[PDB]
Design a protein around this ligand. Structure first.
Ligand SMILES: OC[C@H]1O[C@@H](NC(=S)N/N=C/c2ccccc2O)[C@H](O)[C@@H](O)[C@@H]1O
Ligand SMILES: OC[C@H]1O[C@@H](NC(=S)N/N=C/c2ccccc2O)[C@H](O)[C@@H](O)[C@@H]1O
Ligand SMILES: OC[C@H]1O[C@@H](NC(=S)N/N=C/c2ccccc2O)[C@H](O)[C@@H](O)[C@@H]1O
Ligand SMILES: OC[C@H]1O[C@@H](NC(=S)N/N=C/c2ccccc2O)[C@H](O)[C@@H](O)[C@@H]1O
Lengths: 810, 810
């Protein structure tokens, strides 16, 4: 049908059809008379998967013969989404499979909906790891993602009575066709025990053993014939574990609980032993696998020339003391040489400045679980602090601030300090975030070792986030500028010469309307809700958190409702306001915010005077597969975090790429987006970082705003009095209380500018032609935010490797 | 190589080879350079499995179109062993695959050893279910085996310091290529809750739900193109189960523990709640599946014409009250009609008379777990006892003996009484066992309903137990009488005309020596032990239990040792005494018996004066795959249970089929074996059932034997004084104590006759020609003990269906 989806040649179509039937018969043991819709999905997944194997075997053989420097991307999260469509896109199979299945009497789109998301992450950090994997493959890098094969990923969210309910995401229930178990690489991981000192070295003894069994998932590059590996460890008890008899077998569950479930904390930090175990487990298994591959290529001097380990936040920070442990205790290297190797091998990416999120592990936990690692951390700290003391003599408070060991009620280890000390590179994830790291939270470390500190602005993969989810837009772009932009996104700049093009303007507006109709349909079928597809689609999708200020969005929505009720017969630009996202199950305020959104909807959506002019919808179960549907449909992207709180954001980049305009604060990557697109082509409002600082110095008094803005006073009074909860008048008292007395994120301080800026959004939407020209200017300058650019910078500036866009032989 | 293994045609060999490579590449993602031995096994299993699918799909389609009466064999145990070789044998593929793999540079025998046994049973009961499945398929019966997919089967046994240690049998660790998950047939099973009464019927409410997910395994008939299904249920939590959050997800393990592990109790009875849950779980899921298939063929009158349910012991006895529950509570049939249907549908096979083995479930357990089932059982019992009371007026003690409800300290339900009341047929498993049922433990029931009581003498499948494990013997037989005996084992009678045949005698003796050399080699490699292959192979393999009298065998062994030590320079027929079997982990006396065997070995095997004349070996980890190796190697089969205690035995039949002579008591099937072969061709010794009864009446005094047999006195004194345990002089005091004061199984009473009979065994072995002629006479009359005969009798006399030996179209 459409060109960017590849060729549907007679040979290939014929061959896909017979392989589909072969799998339906031999693999699924069905015929066309008893086959379920899921059998059909599985037949298709096996047919497509077959096309990966040759390239996968030769890619890995190629790395063995050429022996390049290997990149190990360590993460506790890989938010992959679905694999079927992505595989077809990157193998250029999509049109062929569409034709093959159509001829077999099946709708491929329907089969695609059967696949479960691999929901092995929470949000931006997990999704970033997935985009990175795609880019590393596309750029021909010898890269491996290492993580944990969770049995349960991020919970499925159900909304019951306007409240979030959690249900287990049993994503492996029917089997995962995209994984290959690698039992030959099963590795022991040790826990507890004690440290013994002998004549020559310390020994870690009397440990409990859990086995790590790896499962390999392919990661195809975009049409370059490269297939890299994502290797995820699963926990297994050894066979003599606890070996009255029945209980011993049942107790195997305890050991295997390590890989059972993803922690859904979102940003913040729970010092739970099981989380610590997960962090060590991925680190210990991965490092043994790395060393084994390195020896199979004594001379650890060359280790950093053949290995890079990227630490995705502090979650895998134990790689630093674990590498030291293996080098010093097992390989018998001296400390200083081992340390040299470690620092040159490891690099650290920070993904937050929110203090409550930072990992600070109690000493007593590490003492019991990982006694030798604690001793190594203490030694690291002593040597580091001697370095600080020599550089800044007499500065006693710097010593205590920079310590890896934090003093107090309970002693803790600051894992972020551990990461900086033991890494050759530390990066933030957007220019303003990286500046904040040097200027504030890691200021002392920057002064000691300025050469360590870098920026690597985040990006998204244009494969999943344009070609896959928005083929209609990819196509109209490909019609004018060709197809090479899909792996060289800067080429979108060529679209600037079409901003006055009458044919192109009409096409961009058409694609959007088409996407909006499709999504208005999806809302009807799967959720039985009515929406006007001619309204402005105003969307805020992301995890629920106070700093992201879904609350500020709620305030705007209520303002519009009150304005309509005041002057019912005045024209307003119709809006469909869509807010979606999961709340961490232990996060009370976020759960209350969800309830507020649904309660606003209940009032707004059933007011006869409002009509089709304003609708408020909570998008249930926001996840990667839902993002692929809602983002292409959006007109307005809400990116309204308090300046200084969103490290980068990546949802922002996805909306920009897909033809939505952005209303946002100068925070995270928004700054660089407005910089690329021009400020005139962005709806910027609110306090900058400096204004937030100024207000913090004075003291933030929310009352002042309440006293001076009558429209805001009415909203707070409506909330307090039970306007949005008639049967539970005080339901939202926690919300009013926080906004009035304990708002860390200054919701009221940005309210006036936000509403004003939103009026300007409405003004522009009234003129379709000028709205669309500004959209073209956004799409056209979105090239910088390709994760291909991001990865090329990591490779050249951190890992010391050259990316290649050259094909491997097919 | 050998003819019974089928043809190795050029086309088939070529095709198997390319399918092997195709699977190695596409399925296992390997090439010949990185493939592990296990990859090769899996490639071969996928290649062979492919040949099942056509026949499997058409068999099941055939049952749908012809709609025959379906047989449901319900068992908590299916002791399957390995599947690869059995599949090749029954598909006539064995020689072709041997050639294909040889040409690929691989030894098939080596690949076969990689496969894990499906160890989903304990012993004879579990193995019987497996032989039955094979025969039902071979006989063209529309049969389904239903059970539980245990995550862990029977424990692997390790011997440490002569003591049994248990290790978890994680048989699914690498995936099972022989199962197909059937998620579309996932069914809810209910637990706990309470019973409510409404205007029209009782309702079972407030239950906890566990899901039952079925996995289908093919069961191929012998070269008839029939492939039947074994369907095993797996336990899965529903997704909202327990849904702080982390704990709720981890707690899913509790629900799923139902299908986690096989109870290894062996014969006896532990009233453990988890076992009760397993019993209901298999029953509830299976019955819903049966009814669903029946409706898809309101009119439950025809239910018994289209369904037979065979209850394999009392383990699935809850099928009776569960069927009533569905019929009365859900389908709204009246009691009497529902009961009619139930009785005509269900039949019961008893597999024991040992009182401690009988299931008697405490009322309070059923009350909490299955409240509606308890009410149904009470009602069944009331109606049954009214029947008893009308038939035997005034007989008040008969009423209490026949009650399903047993009175006492704790009230219990006698499940065996439940089974007889609600079944149209009750059978024992050998003629003497079935007689004992009518005469003693079920005497009252026999008097009330004599027409219910039947015999179905056990059998074994000549496919696994001759063709597969002993191809050399199958071949020399096929050379003289053709191949048709493999599915019509009575044809072995034709071998009687070869008993004087000089060529045949030499061949039978050759095959045996070959099997003994092979097994003497296996012992060397895998266990580094030395044995003389020219010695008599004296083997007792079976679970360890006092009634099986491994102890009597031990006494004989010590007698031989003492006789050699007394007269070192006298000739004795050399023996290798092999004893193997697992002990139930909670069975102390059985664990002590194992230690005794190893301790005897330690003394005997290292005595310079003994030499190669006597060796005592404990065969570790006896299981189906080890049986296939040891049985063909055996010369003497030890079947020495106290008369009246072994219901049938089946190991006895396997040894007879494979050219060993039998020394045994007139117990279980031994009686019918000696009857078939002639008593002159069997080494019969010891008390008959009547002699045991006579002794019980008088009082068994072990002292009398000790006082009158000097050779026995010496043994007991050696045991007591620490001759067999120098560092732990009193180690075996529990054993001496039991034999002297508390022996239920009268070991001393059979000692003299046993030793005498054993001397006669040695006498015959000294004359190879006459030993072998007696062997031919055993093989020649073993036809009755084919499970094809057994199943044909179940079908005609219980299920009301005609077996067919006709081929389905290929
Ligand atoms: O089908 C369900 C099962 O599939 C197996 N995968 C196999 S046997 N081969 N996979 C081959 C493969 C081939 C190309 C790309 C990805 C792949 O997983 C997996 O090892 C197993 O965990 C999973 O449950
Ligand atoms: O760089 C990619 C993205 O990283 C996110 N940080 C996240 S999602 N941190 N998550 C931390 C976390 C910590 C413990 C448990 C679950 C979690 O998601 C940042 O908030 C976002 O600005 C940035 O665009
Ligand atoms: O390979 C490992 C996996 O294999 C799957 N089986 C599939 S996808 N097909 N099986 C087809 C089949 C075909 C003929 C005979 C027996 C069979 O299981 C099983 O459903 C799964 O539980 C298992 O872990
Ligand atoms: O009919 C087949 C065989 O059945 C066996 N009975 C067994 S193996 N009962 N097992 C009962 C049992 C009961 C609870 C838990 C585990 C168990 O193996 C009989 O002992 C044997 O004589 C007969 O040949």
């Amino acid at each position: 049908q459409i060109s960017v989806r590849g060729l549907a040649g007679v040979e290939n179509v014929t061959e896909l059809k017979k392989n589909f039937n072969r799998h339906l018969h031999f693999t699924l043991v069905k015929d066309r008379n008893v086959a379920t819709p899921r059998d059909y999905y599985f037949a298709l997944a096996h047919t497509v998967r077959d096309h990966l194997v040759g390239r996968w075997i030769r890619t890995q053989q190629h790395y063995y013969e050429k022996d390049p420097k290997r990149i190990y991307y360590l993460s506790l999260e890989f938010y992959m989404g679905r694999t079927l469509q992505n595989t077809m896109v990157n193998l250029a199979l999509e049109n062929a499979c569409d034709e093959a299945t159509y001829q077999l009497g099946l709708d491929m789109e329907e089969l695609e909906e059967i696949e479960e998301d691999a929901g092995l992450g929470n949000g931006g950090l997990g999704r970033l790891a997935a985009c990175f994997l795609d880019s590393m493959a596309t750029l021909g890098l010898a890269a491996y993602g290492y993580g944990i094969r969770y049995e349960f990923g991020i919970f499925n969210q159900k909304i019951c009575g306007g409240w979030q309910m959690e249900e287990a995401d049993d994503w492996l229930r029917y089997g995962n066709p995209w994984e290959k178990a690698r039992p030959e690489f099963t590795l022991p991981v040790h826990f507890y025990g004690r440290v013994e000192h002998t004549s020559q070295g310390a020994k870690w003894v009397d440990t409990q053993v859990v086995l790590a069994m790896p499962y390999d998932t392919p990661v195809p590059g975009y049409r370059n014939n490269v297939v890299n590996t994502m290797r995820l460890w699963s926990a297994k008890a050894p066979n003599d574990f606890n070996l009255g008899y029945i209980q011993a077998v049942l107790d195997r569950n305890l050991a295997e609980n390590i890989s059972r479930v993803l922690y859904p904390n979102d940003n913040f930090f729970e010092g739970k032993e099981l989380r610590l175990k997960q962090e060590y487990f991925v680190v210990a298994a991965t490092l043994q696998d790395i060393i084994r591959r390195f020896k199979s290529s004594t001379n650890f001097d060359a280790f950093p020339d053949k290995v890079a380990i990227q630490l995705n936040d502090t979650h895998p920070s134990l790689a630093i003391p674990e590498l030291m442990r293996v080098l010093v205790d097992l390989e018998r290297l001296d400390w200083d040489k081992a340390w040299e190797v470690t620092v040159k091998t490891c690099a650290y990416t920070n993904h937050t400045v929110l203090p409550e999120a930072l990992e600070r592990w109690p000493v007593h936990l590490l003492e019991t679980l990982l006694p030798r690692h604690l001793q190594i951390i203490y030694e690291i700290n002593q040597r580091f602090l001697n370095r600080v003391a020599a550089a800044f003599p007499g500065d006693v408070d710097r010593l205590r601030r920079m310590s890896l060991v934090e003093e107090g009620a309970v002693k803790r280890i600051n894992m972020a300090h551990l990461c900086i000390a033991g890494s050759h590179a530390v990066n933030g994830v957007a220019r303003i975030h990286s500046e904040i790291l040097k200027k504030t939270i890691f200021k002392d470390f920057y002064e000691l070792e300025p050469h360590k500190f870098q920026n690597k602005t985040n990006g998204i993969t244009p494969r999943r986030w344009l070609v896959l989810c928005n083929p209609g837009l990819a196509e109209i772009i490909a019609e004018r500028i060709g197809e090479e932009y899909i792996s060289d996104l800067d080429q979108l700049r060529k679209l600037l010469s079409y901003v006055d093009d009458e044919a192109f303007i009409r096409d961009v507006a058409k694609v959007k309307q088409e996407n909006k109709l499709k999504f208005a349909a999806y809302l009807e079928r799967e959720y039985k809700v009515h929406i006007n597809p001619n309204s402005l689609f105003d969307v805020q999708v992301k995890r629920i958190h106070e700093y992201k200020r879904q609350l500020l969005n709620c305030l705007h929505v209520i303002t519009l409702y009150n304005r309509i009720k005041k002057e019912p017969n005045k024209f307003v630009v119709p809006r469909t306001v869509m807010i979606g996202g999961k709340a961490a199950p232990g996060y009370h305020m976020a759960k209350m915010i969800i309830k507020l959104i649904t309660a606003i909807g209940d009032v707004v959506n059933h007011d006869p005077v409002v009509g089709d002019r304003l609708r408020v919808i909570f998008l249930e179960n926001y996840r990667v597969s839902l993002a692929e549907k809602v983002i292409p449909a959006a007109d307005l992207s809400e990116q309204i975090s308090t300046a200084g709180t969103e490290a980068s954001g990546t949802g922002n980049m996805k909306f920009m790429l897909n033809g939505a305009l952005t209303i946002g604060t100068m925070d995270g990557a928004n700054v660089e987006m407005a910089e690329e697109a021009g400020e005139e082509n962005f709806f910027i409002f609110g306090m900058r970082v400096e204004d937030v600082d100024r207000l913090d110095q004075r003291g933030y008094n929310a009352q002042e705003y309440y006293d001076r803005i009558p429209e805001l006073r009415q909203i707070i009074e409506q909330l307090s009095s039970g306007f949005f909860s008639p049967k539970q008048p005080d339901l939202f008292k926690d919300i009013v209380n926080m906004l009035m007395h304990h708002d860390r994120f200054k919701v009221f301080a940005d309210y006036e500018e936000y509403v004003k800026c939103q009026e300007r959004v409405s003004a522009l939407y009234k003129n379709p032609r000028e709205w669309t020209r500004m959209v073209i200017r956004n799409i056209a300058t979105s090239g910088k935010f390709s994760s291909d650019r991001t990865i090329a910078q990591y490779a050249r500036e951190i890992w010391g490797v050259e990316p290649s866009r050259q094909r491997l032989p097919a």
